Protein backbone atom coordinates (compact mmCIF):
# COMPACT_ATOMS: atom_id res chain seq x y z
CA UNK A 1 0.00 0.00 0.00
CA UNK A 2 2.76 2.46 0.90
CA UNK A 3 4.95 1.79 -2.16
CA UNK A 4 2.95 0.51 -5.13
CA UNK A 5 -0.10 2.79 -4.87
CA UNK A 6 0.53 6.20 -6.43
CA UNK A 7 -2.66 8.29 -6.17
CA UNK A 8 -5.63 8.03 -3.81
CA UNK A 9 -9.21 9.30 -4.02
CA UNK A 10 -11.23 10.46 -1.01
CA UNK A 11 -14.95 11.11 -0.57
CA UNK A 12 -17.07 12.00 2.43
CA UNK A 13 -18.17 8.96 4.42
CA UNK A 14 -21.51 7.68 3.05
CA UNK A 15 -24.38 7.90 5.50
CA UNK A 16 -25.37 4.31 4.64
CA UNK A 17 -22.46 2.92 6.67
CA UNK A 18 -22.89 2.57 10.43
CA UNK A 19 -20.43 1.14 12.98
CA UNK A 20 -21.49 -1.92 14.93
CA UNK A 21 -21.10 -0.03 18.22
CA UNK A 22 -23.75 2.43 16.97
CA UNK A 23 -26.39 -0.23 16.26
CA UNK A 24 -28.97 1.46 18.50
CA UNK A 25 -29.21 4.31 15.98
CA UNK A 26 -30.89 1.81 13.63
CA UNK A 27 -33.80 1.09 15.99
CA UNK A 28 -37.03 2.40 14.48
CA UNK A 29 -40.77 2.12 15.08
CA UNK A 30 -43.53 1.12 12.67
CA UNK A 31 -47.26 1.26 13.42
CA UNK A 32 -49.69 -1.28 11.99
CA UNK A 33 -53.41 -0.48 12.40
CA UNK A 34 -55.65 -2.69 14.50
CA UNK A 35 -56.86 -5.96 13.01
CA UNK A 36 -60.41 -5.32 14.26
CA UNK A 37 -60.86 -2.71 11.52
CA UNK A 38 -62.92 -3.79 8.51
CA UNK A 39 -62.50 -2.07 5.15
CA UNK A 40 -65.61 -1.36 3.10
CA UNK A 41 -65.93 -2.44 -0.54
CA UNK A 42 -69.57 -1.43 -1.07
CA UNK A 43 -70.92 1.91 -2.32
CA UNK A 44 -73.45 4.10 -0.53
CA UNK A 45 -76.94 4.34 -2.07
CA UNK A 46 -78.93 7.57 -1.78
CA UNK A 47 -82.72 7.36 -1.62
CA UNK A 48 -85.79 9.17 -0.34
CA UNK A 49 -89.43 8.28 0.29
CA UNK A 50 -90.67 11.88 -0.18
CA UNK B 1 -108.92 -30.50 34.29
CA UNK B 2 -110.39 -29.21 31.05
CA UNK B 3 -108.17 -26.87 29.03
CA UNK B 4 -109.62 -23.46 28.21
CA UNK B 5 -106.52 -21.50 27.16
CA UNK B 6 -103.18 -22.98 26.12
CA UNK B 7 -101.90 -20.49 23.53
CA UNK B 8 -102.59 -20.07 19.86
CA UNK B 9 -101.57 -18.26 16.71
CA UNK B 10 -99.81 -15.05 17.75
CA UNK B 11 -100.03 -11.92 15.60
CA UNK B 12 -96.74 -10.12 14.92
CA UNK B 13 -96.82 -6.37 14.39
CA UNK B 14 -93.74 -5.92 12.19
CA UNK B 15 -92.17 -7.90 9.35
CA UNK B 16 -88.48 -6.98 9.43
CA UNK B 17 -86.90 -7.76 6.02
CA UNK B 18 -83.46 -9.11 7.03
CA UNK B 19 -81.98 -8.35 3.61
CA UNK B 20 -80.81 -5.32 1.69
CA UNK B 21 -83.64 -3.86 -0.39
CA UNK B 22 -83.32 -1.54 -3.36
CA UNK B 23 -85.26 1.73 -2.97
CA UNK B 24 -88.98 1.39 -3.65
CA UNK B 25 -92.17 3.41 -3.38
CA UNK B 26 -95.37 2.62 -1.50
CA UNK B 27 -97.13 -0.65 -2.27
CA UNK B 28 -99.74 -2.55 -0.31
CA UNK B 29 -102.38 -0.60 1.61
CA UNK B 30 -101.06 2.62 0.03
CA UNK B 31 -100.18 2.43 -3.66
CA UNK B 32 -98.07 5.25 -5.10
CA UNK B 33 -99.19 6.44 -8.53
CA UNK B 34 -96.01 8.40 -9.19
CA UNK B 35 -93.20 6.91 -11.26
CA UNK B 36 -90.72 4.60 -9.57
CA UNK B 37 -87.41 6.13 -8.45
CA UNK B 38 -85.07 6.54 -11.41
CA UNK B 39 -81.90 4.47 -11.13
CA UNK B 40 -79.12 6.76 -12.36
CA UNK B 41 -75.66 5.37 -13.13
CA UNK B 42 -73.74 8.32 -11.70
CA UNK B 43 -70.35 8.82 -10.04
CA UNK B 44 -68.41 6.62 -12.45
CA UNK B 45 -64.69 6.15 -11.74
CA UNK B 46 -63.09 5.14 -15.07
CA UNK B 47 -64.45 7.44 -17.81
CA UNK B 48 -66.72 5.42 -20.08
CA UNK B 49 -68.90 6.78 -22.92
CA UNK B 50 -67.24 10.25 -22.83
**Structure method:** cryo-EM
Length of chain B: 50
Minimal Cα distance from B20: which residue of A?
Answer: A45
DSSP for A6-44 reads ------PPPTT---GGGGGGG--------TT-----SPP
Resolution of the coordinates, Å:
2.6
Query: How far is B24 from chain A, CA to nearest CA, in Å?
Result: 8
Task: Name the burial class of residue B25, with classes exposed (0-12), middle (13-18) and buried (19+) by CB atoms within 10 angstroms of its CB.
Answer: middle
CA B38 to chain centre: 17
- Backbone dihedral region for residue B28 (phi beyond 0: left; psi -120 to 50: alpha; all else: beta): left
Nearest Cα residue to A47 out of B19, B21, B34: B21
Q: Which residues contact A49 (CB under 8 A, 6 or more apart)?
A: B25, B26
Amino acid sequence: SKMNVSYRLYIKTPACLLPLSDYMRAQHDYVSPSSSRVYIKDPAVVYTRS
Amino acid sequence: GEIIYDGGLSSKLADVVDKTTEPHNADGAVKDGRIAPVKLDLEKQKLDKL
